[PDB]
């Protein structure tokens, strides 16, 4: 069972690398979303001043 445990440990490391990559791409997408909503905020500010 020890060899099984060690192999599964290495596989788990592989999968945490994969998850790190996915999380980075998620961060990028949320950044784009926030930029769009920031432009929306600017328009709203113009309306308030009017």
């Amino acid at each position: 069972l020890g060899k099984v445990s060690d192999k599964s440990r290495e596989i788990s490391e592989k999968y945490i690398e994969e998850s790190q990559a996915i999380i980075q791409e998620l961060v990028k997408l949320t950044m784009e979303k926030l930029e769009s909503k920031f432009t929306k905020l600017c328009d709203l500010e113009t309306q308030l001043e009017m």
Partner: protein, 60 residues
């Protein structure tokens, strides 16, 4: 798009079998693992991050 008992059991069994076959190193999933990572997409996203960071740096 529909979920029945047969579909659910087949899905769970497929996941289990894939995991076990991966434990014994009886499967080569380079295509899936490099379509999910997608190193080209990694480089694209990294350059986009760099450009956005430069933009935020220069606005001050």
């Amino acid at each position: 798009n529909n979920v029945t008992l047969k579909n659910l059991t087949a899905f769970q069994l497929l996941s289990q079998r894939e995991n076990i076959c991966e434990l014994l190193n009886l499967v080569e999933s380079t295509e899936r693992h490099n379509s999910i990572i997608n190193p080209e997409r990694q480089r694209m996203s990294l350059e986009e991050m760099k450009k956005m960071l430069d933009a935020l740096k220069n606005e001050r």
